[PDB]
């Protein structure tokens, strides 16, 4: 889910902003 | 700030920093 998005690649703090959807 | 990694706590932690002030919630996993 979400761990496979940032834990696999270095996401930008802006990508996490979407994590709060 | 980018160029970092996470998982388990680091995730809910980093996720809690980007949505700390603004937002006003989390996600409610499981």
UniProtKB/Swiss-Prot annotation, chain B:
Q: Outcome of residue 22 to Q?
A: In MODY10; reduces binding affinity to INSR; reduces biological activity; reduces folding properties
Highest taxon of the source? Eukaryota
Protein name per UniProt: Insulin B chain
Organism, per UniProt?
Homo sapiens (Human)
Lineage here is:
Eukaryota, Metazoa, Chordata, Craniata, Vertebrata
The coding gene here is INS
């Amino acid at each position: 889910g979400i761990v496979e998005q940032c834990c696999t690649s270095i996401c930008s703090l802006y990508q996490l902003e979407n994590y709060c959807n | 700030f980018v160029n970092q990694h996470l998982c388990g706590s680091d995730l809910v932690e980093a996720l809690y920093l980007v949505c700390g002030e603004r937002g006003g919630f989390y996600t409610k996993p499981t």
